[PDB]
Amino acid sequence: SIDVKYIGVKSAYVSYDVQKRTIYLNITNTLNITNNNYYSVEVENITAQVQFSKTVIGKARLNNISIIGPLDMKQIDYTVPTVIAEEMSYMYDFCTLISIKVHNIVLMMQVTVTTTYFGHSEQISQERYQYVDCG
Amino acid sequence: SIDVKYIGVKSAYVSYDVQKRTIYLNITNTLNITNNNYYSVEVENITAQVQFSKTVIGKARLNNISIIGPLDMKQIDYTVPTVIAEEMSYMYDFCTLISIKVHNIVLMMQVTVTTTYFGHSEQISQERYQYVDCG
Amino acid sequence: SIDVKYIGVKSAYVSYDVQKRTIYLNITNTLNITNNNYYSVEVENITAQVQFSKTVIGKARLNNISIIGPLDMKQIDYTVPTVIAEEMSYMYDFCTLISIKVHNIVLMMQVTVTTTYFGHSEQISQERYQYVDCG
Amino acid sequence: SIDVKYIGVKSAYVSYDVQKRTIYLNITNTLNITNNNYYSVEVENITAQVQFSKTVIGKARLNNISIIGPLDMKQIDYTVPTVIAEEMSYMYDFCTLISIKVHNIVLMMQVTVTTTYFGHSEQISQERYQYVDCG
């Protein structure tokens, strides 16, 4: 990649910016520029490419074969009980969380058994997060 | 990629911006520019490409074969009980969450058993999040 | 990559920026520039590439074969009980979290059994986080 | 890579920036520049590449074979009980966390049984974090 970037607040080529109780006074702001940006990306002069697969079987005898590809989950539990047995009793609760198997961002590519692959591949995930907030 | 970017508030080529109790006064803001941006991306001079697959079988004998591709889930549980047995009793609750298997963003590409692939592939996920907020 | 960068607040080519109780006064700000940026990335002069696979079987005898690819999960538990047996009793709670198997960001690429691969591959994850906040 | 960098607050080519109770007064700020940046990255003059695999089997006899690829999890537990048996009793709680198997950022590439690979591969993870905050 080129230029992959995370600005928390503010960004610029230039900024004469100001704020609050500012007496920006009697000013000469000049700005001659000559910004000239060129890009030549993933450029391919190829005269012969091939992606050949060949699967020859003859007089063979094949039993109890299992190709499992990735991320086989199996026989999973999440047992999560709660009880509140009150008697002559005050309860207050607040911001009271029972998170179980939360996801947010789940990106996959070329999750395979096989691949003949040829080229650019990419993954990008700029962000802000906050799971919980209270007062 | 080129130029993949996350601005929290504000962004610009230029910004003479101002705020609040600002006496921006008696000013000369000039700005000569010559911004010249060129892009030449994923450009392909190819004289011969091939993606060949061939599957020859003869006098073979094949039993109990299982190709499972990825993400086989199997036999999963999420048991999540709650009880509130009150007697002569005040309960207050607030912001009281029982999240179970929440997702947000789920992007997939080339989730296969096989692939002969040729070219650019890409994935991008700019964001803000907040699961919970209270007061 | 080129240029992969995380700015907490603010960023620029230039910044004459100011703030609060600022008497920026009687000023001459000039700025001659000649910013000239060139990029020539992932550029490929190839005269012959091949990705050849060949799978010859004859008079063979094959039993109880299992190709598992990665991330096979199996037979997993998460037992998480809670009890609150109150009598003549005040309870206060706040910001009271029972997180179990939370994720945020989950990016995969070429998670395979096999791959003949040819080219650029990339992964990028700029961010801010905060799991919990309270007062 | 080139240029991979983490700025906590603010960044620039130049910054005449100012703050608070500033009397920036009677000033001449000039700035002649000639910033000229060139990049020539992952550039490949190749006249013959090959990625050849060949799998010849004859009159062989194969039993009880198991290729497991990486990250095989198996038979895992997380038993996490809590009890609160109050009688004639005040409880206060705050910011009271029972984190179990939280992740944040999980990036994988070429997690395989095999790979014939040819090229650039990359991974980058600029960030701020804070698990917990309270007062």
Residue numbers in the entry:
A (entry chain A), B (entry chain E), C (entry chain C), D (entry chain G): 120 to 254
Published text:
pmcAmyotrophic lateral sclerosis/parkinsonism-dementia complex (ALS/PDC or lytico-bodig) is a fatal disease found in the Chamorro population of Guam (1–4), some families on the Kii peninsula of Japan, and the Auyu and Jakai people of New Guinea. Abundant filamentous amyloid inclusions that are made of all six brain tau isoforms are characteristic of ALS/PDC. The greater heterogeneity of amyloid filaments, when compared to CTE and SSPE, probably reflects the fact that ALS/PDC is a multiple proteinopathy based on neuropathology, as suggested for cases from the Kii peninsula.
In addition to tau filaments, we also observed singlets and doublets of transmembrane protein 106B (TMEM106B) filaments (fold I) in the frontal cortex from cases 1 and 2, and TMEM106B singlets (fold I) in the spinal cord from case 2. Senile plaques have been described in around 60% of cases of Guam ALS/PDC and assembly of Aβ is believed to be part of the disease process. Alternatively, these changes may be age-related. This was probably also the reason for the presence of TMEM106B filaments in two cases from Guam and one case from the Kii peninsula.
